[PDB]
Structure formats: C-alpha cells, structure tokens
Amino acid sequence: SVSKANVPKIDVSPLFGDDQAAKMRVAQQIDAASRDTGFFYAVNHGINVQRLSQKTKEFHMSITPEEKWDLAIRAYNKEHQDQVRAGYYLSIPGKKAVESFCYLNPNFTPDHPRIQAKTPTHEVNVWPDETKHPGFQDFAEQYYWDVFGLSSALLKGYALALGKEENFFARHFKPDDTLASVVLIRYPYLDPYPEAAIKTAADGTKLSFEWHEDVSLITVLYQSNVQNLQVETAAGYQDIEADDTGYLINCGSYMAHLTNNYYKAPINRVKWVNAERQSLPFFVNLGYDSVIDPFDPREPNGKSDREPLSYGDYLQNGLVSLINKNGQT
Template sequence: MASIASLLASPPRPSRPTARVPRIDIAPLFGDSAALKKQVAQAIDAASRDTGFFYAVNHGVDLAKLAAETRHFYRALTAADKWRLATGAYNPLHRHKVRGGYSLAVPGHKAVESLCYLNPEFQRDHPRIVAATPLHEVNDWPAACRQPRFRAFAESYYWDVLRVATALLRGYALALHQPEDFFTRHLRRHDTLSSVVLTRYPFLDPYPAPAIKTANDDDGTKLSVDPHRDVSLITVLCQPGRHQNLQVQGTRGQWLDIEPDDSAYLVCCGSYMAHITGEYYPAPVHRVRWLNEERLSLPFYVNLGYDDCIEPWDAADAAAAAASGWRGQVLNHQPLVNRRPIRYGAYLNKGLEDLARVNRQA
C-alpha cells in the first residue's frame, strides 16, 4: 500500500495559467554602456508593472555552488547546533536574537526550518551593535570543527548577492527616471540591513497536518506560506531544483504559476518600493504551494540602512513626463501627499511583525 506521504507528494489541483516572468539579461548593469543599461531598465519597468516578477540572468553568481553548500550545511547540522543557533522565538536564552539565527522545525506542527544571517560587518565593535540598535545582530555560525568552510562561504555569498542587488537597483533607478545611484546611495556595505535566508522544505512521511495550510479561496489550494508581500526594497531569490511551487496573484485576483528556473535569480519589489513609488511598482502578492518534496528556497532581502528614508514621489507622473519628452526635474520629484516618508528601520520592524502574523507565526 502506498504511504500517506507518497499519495500527497503531488496533490491533485486544477491547472493554472502561467505568469509572465521574463528573463532579463542584467550584465549591462555591471558595465558602462548607458544605452544598454537603458534597455535593461525598460525591461525591468515592463516586468514591474506586469506580474511584478522577472528572472535576472547573467548575474555572475554560481547558484549551483550555493545550493550544494546549503545542502551540505543542513546534512551536517546537529540538533545541538540548531539549538545553539536558534532565535529567541525557540530558545529562551536567545532573546537578543530576533532576526538572525535558526528557526527550528517543530515535530508534528511545523516542518520548515531556516537559517537567517545578516550583514557580516555587524561585529561586536560595530557602532550599531554597541548601541544595541534594533534589527542589528551579530551572526552566529555552526561549529567550525564540523562545518569548517560554511562561514567563509556564507559571508562571501552575502557580498556576491549584494553586488547583484546593487546592479539591479541601478536598473530600477533608471527605470523610474531617477539618477543611477538613487537607491544605491542608501545601500552601503557597512550598515545595510539586508539578509540571507536559507530555507529548507523537507520531505516527510507522514507530513504533519498542522504544517499544511489551506488557501482561503474557492480552490482550497494547500499552502506552505500564505499570500503575502515581501518586506524589503527588492527581493532576489534563488530556488534550486525544478519544483513548481510559487504563485503570484494576477490583476483579477487569480493565481498564476511561476515556472521555476534555477539558473537565474527571481526578482520582485518589496512593499517599501511600492510605498515610495505610490504603487507604481507594486509589491506582488504571492504564495507558496505546499509540496511534499525536499527542496530549498534561498532569498536575499535587500534592505537599506536603519536611518535611511526615501521620500515617496509620484513615479507614474514622472514616467508620463518622460514619455512626453519632458526633460525637466520638477515632475520627477512631485511628492505624494497621501504617503508619508518612513525611515527604513521603522518600516522593517513593523513589516516583519505584520508578516509574522500573516504567516501565523506571531
């Protein structure tokens, strides 16, 4: 007789249309050609105002190595390691660990586990750490005797993907008819609040029923993660393997499958981008369909510095002005009176709290 897990490994579901997710060659964003950068920016603009997602190709990062190192990390991790790395939500001795650290699986209730690590510049003598500024934490790592190469690889990857994010933000700035450094002037190596999350979705037999969520819509789709918008400026996601699990909500409320591509980064705007552009570049609502398959999800959440603040402006008006041939600067910076400026630290703190409630983890 087939096991319960094997019967549920590929749950029957109605066929869905596929989301338009273009592949954009971002190599010109690392170069000096203004004409080629403009072409990339136009492609980013079109994708951001459509489904909100695109695949970034020719990014220069070895994603296969990232997947291999992450799988090795999980294979070598012991229960003692997990407890020592656990966030304060799991280990009461670690109340200081709110963002960074290990989120444990809970047998019979929660299956997914993850490691979140922050800016490697956040060391004991960093001014923000000394001042105990919220959202800034020193990373902890697995014991070097069991995982001698993991920390060096993880820190190196952080800077590699930050370089990709920096290039992407140059493209977003140009797409929004702003100076090329409009975003990157706020994305500094020494104080960015950006984070890497290494998430493992396991295969389990039996799979704990409380860990499977049911969508609150007519189709009753089984979910691992409820519908949400990302809390970030932009998100740069690596999804190893060929498991179709991510869905984005279309303009009519319908859910569209995002086809996987493990050679490229999947990119979308977070809710801070939506706020400052007056929803001209919205943060797409998306969800993760439940699959009983061993897989990884490796997002990089691109965040500014704690005190950084970008004043919301009428991005739609700026685009209209550019389309009409206007070359002045006034229309490009019309403030949105119904949207107040928000410092990034306050935005991130509230956004993470709200997201925890959406995912029923508060």
C-alpha cells in the same frame, strides 16, 4: 484551473558595465515586468549558484539538533533574547516542516556603533562550530557580498527604470550599514507529510506559506528546481515557473511605498509540494536611517504626498507584522 505568470528572463549583465544605452534597455525590461506581474528572472548574473546550492545542502543535512538549539532564535530558545532575526529557525516534526538559518550583515560586530547602541533589527550573526561545518561561515559571508554586488546592480536598473539617476537606490545600499539578510530555507520531503504543516487557502489551494507582500526594497531569490511560488493577479493566482539557474526578482513594500504604488509589491504565496527543496532569499534592505523621498512617476511633476518613511522603522514593523499574520517561520 491555474494559469502561469509571465516572468520574463532579463539579461542583467549590462548593469555591471558602462554601456549606458544597453543599461537603459535593461531598465525598460525591469519597468515592464514591474508593471505587469511584478516578477522577472535575472539571468547572466555572474554568481555561482551551483556552489550556493551545494554548500547550503551540506549545512542543512549535517547540522544536528544540539547545534540547532545552540543557534536558535529567541522564538525557539528563551536563552537567546538578542536573536530576533539571526540564527536557526527550527522545524517541529509533525507540525512544522520548514526550517531555516538567517544571517545578517557580517559587519555587524560588537565594534559596530548600531550594536553598541542596541538599535533594533541589528544583531551579531551566530555561526556553528567551524570544525563541524568546515568552510560554511566563509562560504556564507562570501555569498552575502556576492549577492550584495548583484543587488547593487539590480538597483541601478530599477533606478533608471523609474527615470532616476542610476544610484538613486544604490546610494542607500552600503556594506557598512545594510540591514539586508540571507535566509537559507529547507523545505523537506516528508512521508507522511503532516497535515498540520499544510494550510488551505480561500480558493482551496494547499499552501506551505500564506499570501504576503515582501518586507524589502527588492527581493533577490534563488530556489531549487521545484515549482512552488504563485503571484496574485486580478484574475487569481498564477504559477511562477521554477528556474534553478537564475534569480527571481521582485519589489518589496518599501518600493511600493516610495513609488506611490507605481511598482507594486506583488502578493505571493508558497504552494505545498512534497519535495526536498531550497529557498534562499536575499532581502535587499537599506540602512536603519535610510529615507527615500516618495515620488509618483505617473504625474508630470512627479509629486507624491506620501511621507518619507525611515527604513529601520519600516523593517521593524514589517517583520513583526509578517510573523503576526503568517506565523513564526
């Protein structure tokens, strides 16, 4: 038997305003959730998630195998040595059900000094033919900045929640250098569903993706209305209920590092469900050279002996480790 996680719905709209006491009341809710299961739903977020789901569906269901090879990351196409993060992540019929398209900061262009310097984790996005996917690139880039805006407000809530000034995290979250990514994940309905694409957990649960901590500061996730996520607690894994009107928010391991684990990165996994569905995360990453000094909210002096960790090194190591542990997505 599996229990259900407490995932409160938090009205985040005050974080866009100037009612400072109202913002503190949101911060308290974020604090409580971050100290409990680690997840909450952000509601009243102001993003048109219906259009997000529709546009994403039109892309996944119309892109052809030729287009997927042409956009494929290095793991599926040896010709694209520069595509470690951005591009298409192909399914393997009979073996791997999931497929996805990842893109990064639209400001990463050939003119960008990090591209010029060839710094790891920075890449220029790849896109399909505009005529074959009209409006898709424009929708996708607009969405990047829409969810960037929501995430910046959420970071103000996390900052206040930890007893800091509201820009403590957001000051490092900038359009000119953010390593944040969007991933448009398709989980297909398949009949028969290949056993090879289903993993079995230690506790016997059939999974599509094994346990992990998020590589992010925070994760801002939209999913269609199909329950699949589970969060680990001391009493075992608990089901996270689906809500296709809000965003599921949680801390990543960079937040756990800098708070001396006061806000843990919740361990989560994806149950196997034979249903057509969407999983559209926005990983709130900072700049490559962003460093946040660790602190410990449990101590009067707030002192932490943990080393300041550069976000770029954290991200590079984290993404490679996640592939090594849980497999190439």
